[PDB]
Write a protein that binds this ligand. Sequence first.
Ligand SMILES: CN1C[C@@H](c2ccc(S(=O)(=O)N3CCCCC3)cc2)CC1=O
Length: 126
Amino acid sequence: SNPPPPETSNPNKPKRQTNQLQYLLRVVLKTLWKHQFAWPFQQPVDAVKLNLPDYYKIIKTPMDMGTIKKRLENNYYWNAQECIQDFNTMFTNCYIYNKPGDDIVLMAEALEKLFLQKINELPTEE
Ligand SMILES: CN1C[C@@H](c2ccc(S(=O)(=O)N3CCCCC3)cc2)CC1=O
């Protein structure tokens, strides 16, 4: 079976609004979400529907952009680095589970190159 998705809200986790987190939602996530390669990454890997029975035997820290989007919308993150770490987990999982040269890996690599450009332009904390 699929595991439960990663937590996207938590009543005990403190909250704040920052210009860097707003940039991650309004610029970084927005750009990646609408990219033509985004769709396999817009929700948790459904190993049942995709017929990937070993996926969660190999990947123990799943992550996807649907989860990241909810975390940003729900004010789950305290700082930008927590969000950046989640994007990197998503990319790394893809590179670990799949083989170099697979189309899904090429898609992830393209999304990551775009992501790193946008993070290079992260605004300073106000
Ligand atoms: C992040 N993920 C998602 C999982 C997934 C696998 C295959 C398909 S696919 O067969 O639809 N297709 C493959 C070729 C490139 C476009 C998508 C979708 C999702 C695997 C993975 O590491």
